[PDB]
Design a protein around this ligand. Sequence first.
Ligand SMILES: *[C@@H]1O[C@H](CO)[C@@H](O)[C@H](O)[C@H]1NC(C)=O
Lengths: 111, 98, 48
Amino acid sequence: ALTQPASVSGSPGQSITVSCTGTSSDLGNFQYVSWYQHHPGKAPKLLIYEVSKRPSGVSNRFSGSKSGNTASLTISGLQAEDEADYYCCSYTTTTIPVAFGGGTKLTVLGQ
Amino acid sequence: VYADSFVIRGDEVRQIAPGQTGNIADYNYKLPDDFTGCVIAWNSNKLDSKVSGNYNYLYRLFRKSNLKPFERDISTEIYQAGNKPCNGVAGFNCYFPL
Amino acid sequence: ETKCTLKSFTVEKGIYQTSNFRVQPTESIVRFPNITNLCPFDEVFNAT
Ligand SMILES: *[C@@H]1O[C@H](CO)[C@@H](O)[C@H](O)[C@H]1NC(C)=O
């Protein structure tokens, strides 16, 4: 399967890191896992494809890395509109061929 | 051969490794993915420790973005939060990076 | 040996030839130069 924490919070500006993991038997060698962001009332957009490859149009503050069975992303220099619904999508061979996160809702403490 | 000298705050000596990030692996010294050579570490509580805290050592908490490996960040400058008009002194959303 | 080098059970008179007389050594001696210009790892671990 595929799982991530339901919500995360921290100080504005910096100090945030979001991770996903899953069972290695269901996971087909762990390639082509992508990180997206969803906004309320807006269309979702692609941010990271295949762990640590940067597409065009994104900023350098987004980064992603995977160790062992767990993948994660970090972002530095947070802003007042950087609250997000960061999802991880991946391939699962035994069940339904695509798996879509567990739900995230980042909140800030600026107010 | 090359050698360095550090004082690391406790548990993030484990994060000093070729490839994963951490607290001081993005705004401070980080190892590259092709790190030849390795880490010589020992518990020296005998010298770099004194009783009411040691404020003679400094570490960087944040930057504009991630820094490349084998780079030195020596520029000290007041850091604003994105778009706030704020320079010269500290205050709201303007903290020293040390 | 003078039988086994001719593949015969009988050998005639005369002088023959066999393997050589080999003298083997006993031990090994390695003398590279005296240590010098020690690298200053002693001062960096004992640094104040
Ligand atoms: C420091 O110097 C001493 C001799 O005063 C030496 O025995 C030791 O190996 C050196 N290294 C250390 C412990 O930093």
